[PDB]
Amino acid sequence: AQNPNCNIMIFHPTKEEFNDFDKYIAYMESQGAHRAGLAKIIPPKEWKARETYDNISEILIATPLQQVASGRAGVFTQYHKKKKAMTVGEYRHLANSKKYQTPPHQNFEDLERKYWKNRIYNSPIYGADISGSLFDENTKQWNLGHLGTIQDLLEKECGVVIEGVNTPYLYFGMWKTTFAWHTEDMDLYSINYLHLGEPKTWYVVPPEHGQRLERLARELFPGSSRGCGAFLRHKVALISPTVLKENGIPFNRITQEAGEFMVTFPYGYHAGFNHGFNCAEAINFATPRWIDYGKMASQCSCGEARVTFSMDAFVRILQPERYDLWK
Numbered sequence: 001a002q003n004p005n006c007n008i009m010i011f012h013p014t015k016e017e018f019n020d021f022d023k024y025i026a027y028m029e030s031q032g033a034h035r036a037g038l039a040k041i042i043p044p045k046e047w048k049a050r051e052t053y054d055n056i057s058e059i060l061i062a063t064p065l066q067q068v069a070s071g072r073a074g075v076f077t078q079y080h081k082k083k084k085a086m087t088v089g090e091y092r093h094l095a096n097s098k099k100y101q102t103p104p105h106q107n108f109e110d111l112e113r114k115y116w117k118n119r120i121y122n123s124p125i126y127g128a129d130i131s132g133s134l135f136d137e138n139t140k141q142w143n144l145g146h147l148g149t150i151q152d153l154l155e156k157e158c159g160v161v162i163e164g165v166n167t168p169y170l171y172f173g174m175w176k177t178t179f180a181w182h183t184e185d186m187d188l189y190s191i192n193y194l195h196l197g198e199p200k201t202w203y204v205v206p207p208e209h210g211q212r213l214e215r216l217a218r219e220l221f222p223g224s225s226r227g228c229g230a231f232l233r234h235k236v237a238l239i240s241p242t243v244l245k246e247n248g249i250p251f252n253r254i255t256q257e258a259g260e261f262m263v264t265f266p267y268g269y270h271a272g273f274n275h276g277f278n279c280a281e282a283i284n285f286a287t288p289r290w291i292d293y294g295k296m297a298s299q300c301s302c303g304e305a306r307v308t309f310s311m312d313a314f315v316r317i318l319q320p321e322r323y324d325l326w327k
């Protein structure tokens with residue numbers, strides 16, 4: 001078996017290898033990349049997402065989210081308080097203000113220490129889940145707005161035709177902005193391109209060990225666990241690497257820099273934080289190997305977790321018992 005220790009692998013495709021997206025994902029998996037739950041892909045040196053990021057300041061963040069923490073430094077939840085709309089230019093200015101800017105630090109490790117020590121005492125503002133794309137329409141390779149759709153994957157594999165669409169989201173971050181422990185909707189893959197700005201640090205649990213994270217989460221957030229059989233779907237729970245280590249949970253970490261892709265694999269729990277002002281674009285996707293994970297995906301039915309229009313069809317076809325129980 002390839003990659004038995006479930007290490008995060010880093011790939012450097014040539015421009016020739018960067019032409020066929022599906023083929024390269026399959027190649028990464030042939031090398032065991034999926035066992036980690038997360039992989040980094042550094043694009044060919046000749047490749048660009050777009051010519052410049054010069055004129056993005058007029059993008060609107062209709063509903064910026066203030067991420068307010070509760071708990072202790074290594075075990076906390078966050079809720080999102082909606083704020084008034086602001087442009088990306090205004091958001092960038094806010095991110096660089098004295099109140100919100102990245103503190104002095106020695107290196108990524110020092111900054112990581114500061115994040116876990118001090119995160120809960122601040123409430124950074126995140127621009128999340130903004131439908132759109134910053135890929136130039138003429139970018140032919142790894143254009144996250146031009147991927148084959150999950151609906152077409154399901155149709156090719158299973159012969160069922162379903163409603164629904166599949167488009168990218170933009171994420172504008174600042175220092176300490178946080179993404180909670182989660183797998184993707186329907187335990188899909190995701191791909192994430194860091195367009196510009198400061199780095200993003202990721203933590204990930206190997207898919208084969210996901211239940212270990214679930215069990216720890218039930219112990220650490222016992223009320224939440226009683227309220228919902230899949231409360232990590234709510235995307236509000238954080239657990240630090242120190243607490244994971246103390247509880248013997250297998251995980252890895254890596255920092256993504258501007259110009260790099262990350263892929264998360266089916267049922268790879270991940271969490272992380274932004275180092276400073278940045279912009280990422282992400283979208284879910286599927287492969288034939290995903291289908292069995294989609295069938296097994298745990299669902300929130302307490303009502304807290306958002307179920308998109310397109311998710312409906314996934315549940316209806318892959319999980320008809322769970323769907324009927326909904327209805």
Ligand SMILES: Cc1cc2nc[nH]c2cc1C
Nearest residue numbers: 207208211267296297298
């Ligand atoms: C181990 C395991 C547990 C799961 N629970 C939901 N999907 C799953 C997929 C795997 C692989």
Ligand SMILES: O=C(O)CNC(=O)C(=O)O
Nearest residue numbers: 171179190191192280282
């Ligand atoms: O970047 C973020 O804020 C969170 N992104 C993801 O969880 C992802 O791409 O799968």
Ligand code: NI
Nearest residue numbers: 183184190264
């Ligand atoms: Ni994700």
Ligand SMILES: [Zn+2]
Nearest residue numbers: 228300302304
């Ligand atoms: Zn729930």
